[PDB]
Design a protein around this ligand. Structure first.
Ligand code: A1ECU
Length: 301
């Protein structure tokens, strides 16, 4: 019920210069690029997104909605929406995450530092979510894929297409149909489309399991239609090899059926925080020019 005094910044399409095409597909097309606030003497590196290329006026609904959310978040572990450009096709100008998705990164570099990296990432993602929990925001699509790498030491949560902001008396979002990422999703949601902050904890568990397994596919082989029952019988993802019981037990708590006996993000920070002060006790792995980054180009507005 608090007034969302966020500022939406509209950018002249001339101020920035597309440069290459990082990925394309469902989202549409993301372009590595560069933004030069005029008469400002900084060059800010950016991703520039547009959903494919067809008019589809229902699409701009969705773009302008993710832009609404991102405009309303500001945390060191959540993606910064920089502004939009009101071209025929509407574009989201976002901060460039130079190292790509965490999913890729862990896959590409299975020579990944032990918990120092792994458990540090676990802390930073819990901080990210706990913030959205303050902001009464429910991500509904937490996954290794949707976490970007600014540096190997600093990650941020992205992709707010499915995000929903709870009203001041909304425990759950009661969603319509659609294609949903079934393997990352609480059961109460897979069955009753009831999404919650605690449902987001479950997706945090699958994400952690993704990182601990260096990129494995949840329930690989299984067909998503099965998942609902599989998890109803009592089944869960396995204990990843490098995982001590201490870590694996935390993952398993995020996957309880009663969502109120699942742990809270503020606790997840604390616990992983503790573990990351003695990383090797918990994770066992063999061998352990005018540019300004956006995190320093603070509001000219
Ligand atoms: C500029 O660095 C990036 C590089 C890449 N690669 C991946 C491999 C990479 N190799 C070099 C660096 N290390 C060491 C790893 C390997 C080079 C090219 C990607 N692509 C992916 O990691 C997959 Cl997704 Cl192809 C991204 C970015 N950067 C970026 N920044 C902001 C956003 Cl908002 C974004 N979104 C975005 C971008 C693409 C697709 C989808 C999405 P969305 C809207 C759904 O989040 N990307």
């Amino acid at each position: 019920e608090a007034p969302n005094q966020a500022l939406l910044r509209i950018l002249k399409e001339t101020e920035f210069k597309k440069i290459k095409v990082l990925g394309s597909g469902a989202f549409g097309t993301v372009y590595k690029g560069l933004w030069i606030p005029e008469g400002e003497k900084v060059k800010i590196p950016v991703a520039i997104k547009e959903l494919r290329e067809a008019t589809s006026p229902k699409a701009n609904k969705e773009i302008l909605d993710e832009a609404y959310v991102m405009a309303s978040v500001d945390n060191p572990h959540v993606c910064r929406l920089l502004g939009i450009c009101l071209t025929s096709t509407v574009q989201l100008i976002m901060q460039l995450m130079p190292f790509g998705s965490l999913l890729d990164y862990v896959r590409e570099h299975k020579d990944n530092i032990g918990s120092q990296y792994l458990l540090n990432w676990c802390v930073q993602i819990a901080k990210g979510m706990n913030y959205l929990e303050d902001r009464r925001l429910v991500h509904r699509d937490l996954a290794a894929r949707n976490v970007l790498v600014k540096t190997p030491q600093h990650v941020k949560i992205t992709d707010f297409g499915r995000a929903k902001l709870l009203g001041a008396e909304e425990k759950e979002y009661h969603a319509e149909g659609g294609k949903v990422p079934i393997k990352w999703m609480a059961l109460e949601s897979i069955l009753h489309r009831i999404y919650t902050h605690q449902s987001d904890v479950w997706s945090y568990g699958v994400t952690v399991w993704e990182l601990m397994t260096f990129g494995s596919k949840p329930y690989d082989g299984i067909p998503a239609s099965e998942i609902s029952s599989i998890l109803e019988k009592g089944e869960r993802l396995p204990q990843p090899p490098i995982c001590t019981i201490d870590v694996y037990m935390i993952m398993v708590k995020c996957w309880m059926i009663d969502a109120d006996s699942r742990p809270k993000f503020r606790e997840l920070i604390i616990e992983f925080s503790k573990m990351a002060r003695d990383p090797q006790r918990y994770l066992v792995i063999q061998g352990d020019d005018d540019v300004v980054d956006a995190d320093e180009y603070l509001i000219p507005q």
